[PDB]
């Protein structure tokens, strides 16, 4: 309903999953309990919205040798973690990408994206900015000495 405020009131918004690439981009990559999960987000972005009771389980893979931030030279081996790992988190936002070369057609398709980890910081630093203070200000008035 907020997407229709920018791509036309009476349009079709279709959700599709990632187009392809590395595992860190096509899957929901994250850390939980020390382990690095890569979950299948094809059951969340598989929909088609026109102008007008259980849980969705997603298959998650686990990788120990990672190279996050697209860094070459340093590969980190995540040590195994004893015990069943359970974690409860909040999905508080998305990083979407729109398909191009449309011209024809009134529908718009959105797919999960990411890669650049700076976007993860931009989602919290949008309401802050740094300024420098220059306390020296000259101004005219009817004051002097003799």
């Amino acid at each position: 309903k907020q997407l229709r405020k920018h791509f036309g009131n009476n349009t079709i918004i279709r959700f599709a999953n990632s187009s392809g690439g590395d595992l860190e981009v096509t899957t929901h990559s994250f850390n939980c309990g020390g382990e690095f999960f890569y979950c299948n987000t094809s059951g969340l972005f598989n929909s088609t919205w026109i102008s007008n009771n259980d849980s969705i389980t997603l298959p998650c893979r686990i990788k120990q040798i990672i190279n996050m931030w697209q860094r070459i030279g340093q590969a980190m081996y995540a040590p195994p973690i004893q015990g069943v790992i359970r974690c409860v988190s909040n999905i508080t936002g998305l990083i979407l990408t729109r398909d191009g070369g449309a011209n024809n057609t009134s529908t718009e398709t959105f797919r999960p994206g990411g890669g650049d980890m700076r976007d993860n910081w931009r989602s919290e630093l949008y309401k802050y900015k740094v300024v420098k203070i220059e306390p020296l200000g000259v101004a005219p008035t009817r004051c002097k000495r003799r």
Partner: protein
Amino acid sequence: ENLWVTVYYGVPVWKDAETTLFCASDAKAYETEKHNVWATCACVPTDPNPQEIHLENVTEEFNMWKNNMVEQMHTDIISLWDQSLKPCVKLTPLCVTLQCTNVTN
């Protein structure tokens, strides 16, 4: 009638710039210890009673896409990851041939 310049020191005048930001992470997080978890080692404890002064009549332009705090935080976390992995065990003699098989199932 003729005006004269006068220097004022302490005027609310700021300009957009970039500087070196430091950290802050409460006081209970430092009690988490466990041989310095993540970053909090020599980080300044957060002020117990922070102050937020609402600048009345003030309209300031922000730009989340041209903000330097993001780049600084990114490079900070990268350097954090390197400093956190410098004194750890290096698995140099681990690229040996692996005679692997299926798991017992």
